[PDB]
Chain A
């Protein structure tokens, strides 16, 4: 089974290799800068005293670690080979899976947190504490470990037509456990998060549209337009950034596709789109947060 090593036979052209290179470089730089800026502002100014800032910092840390794997992936694409050895293969793959799930589970938590605030305001008094935010981050990390730890054992370098593939090795039969992993990744990293955020935000908007305030209906319609607009943005960004690579992985598990320039370029673009979610999360969840905005 191929993983990082892409069957590229038919050496790349000039414009495509530069494009894929600029892709990995730009997403990495933007992702690292935006998330380190969030972590700096939190550590320097806001101080992480609130549940919201505890979630924001956890999201920025995961998003920074996710994009920190891109220099390895770029070089792996350039040379058409993994040159960093067996230990770094285990470390980068584990970090990559750990922080895909940590990033995604944290932004799901922020959706559930806002749903609880609106639809269960009494229970929100118990849930929205800094103590519970740290507990939730730990529980989400334990859940992420169900895949992040096994891939540390499964990941290894093996020879593949002279070149080196940093890939995963599975128990027997490989065709069962490899596809189970792909399915579990698809449902825990994409299907479940899309369901959580659409239902939580949808129920949040429905509750906000049901209030009738005897006086200022204009002020209510205005806030509802802004909240509904933000809901549509954060959901559309998640779907645009994560759907392509998840569907691409499933299709390659089912059929064999003709190795062409368009397939190669689209594959790395879909990979890059997944990491662009880590680039946009600082905007959606930190710089546009109501309290974080004020502290700039």
Chain B
């Protein structure tokens, strides 16, 4: 049905930056939300944005460091993560709404904040 393609994850040193992107190239859904699950924690809301791309909503834990945007022309969702800490190490999931809580979820992308990176 819907295939959410997540990109941009991986390893970063603490204080570094990552940009996640998520697309549904078939236009069958609107990627609009970002969630994450730490290794031992529950799934937690990170950020979301309206269909228009105008109004983002951030979790208090990331409001000072994360920015989200939506390219309405090509249905791409972005998450810019700055000043990454260890508490940001998690699998990040893209969430999308059908054109007709979210209806679709990506398989997730690992984000690991460690000093053993470059």
Contacts and interface: CB of A to CB of B under 8 A. Distances in A.
A290 B53 contact: no
Contact of B73 (A124, A210, A214, A216): A210
A118 B80 contact: no
B50 interface: yes
Interface residues of A, number: 32
Given A211-B73, A215-B99, A128 B52 contact: no
Interface stretch (B33-41, B63-71, B85-93, B103-111): B63-71
A244 interface: no
B51 A223 contact: yes
A227 B73 CA distance: 17
A216 B99 contact: yes
Nearest to B65: A129
Given A213-B27, A213-B75, A122 B54 contact: no
Contacts of A219: 51, 99-100
A132 B75 CA distance: 26
A212 B52 CA distance: 13
Nearest to B19: A125
Given A49-B63, A122-B78, A125-B19, A117 B54 contact: yes
A211 B78 contact: no
Nearest to B73: A211
A124 B56 CA distance: 11
A133 B34 CA distance: 23
B57 interface: yes
19 contacts: A49-B60, A49-B63, A117-B53, A118-B72, A125-B67, A125-B78, A125-B80, A130-B64, A207-B72, A207-B73, A208-B52, A208-B72, A211-B72, A215-B28, A215-B99, A219-B99, A219-B100, A223-B51, A227-B54
Interface of A: 47, 49-50, 52, 114, 117-118, 121-122, 124-126, 128-130, 204, 207-208, 210-216, 219-220, 223, 227, 289-291
Given A49-B58, A125-B78, 13 more contacts: A52-B55, A118-B53, A121-B76, A128-B56, A128-B69, A129-B67, A207-B73, A210-B73, A214-B26, A215-B27, A219-B51, A223-B51, A291-B55
Rank and list the top 5 A-B pairs by shortest CB-CB distance, nearest first. A216-B99, A290-B55, A125-B80, A215-B99, A49-B63
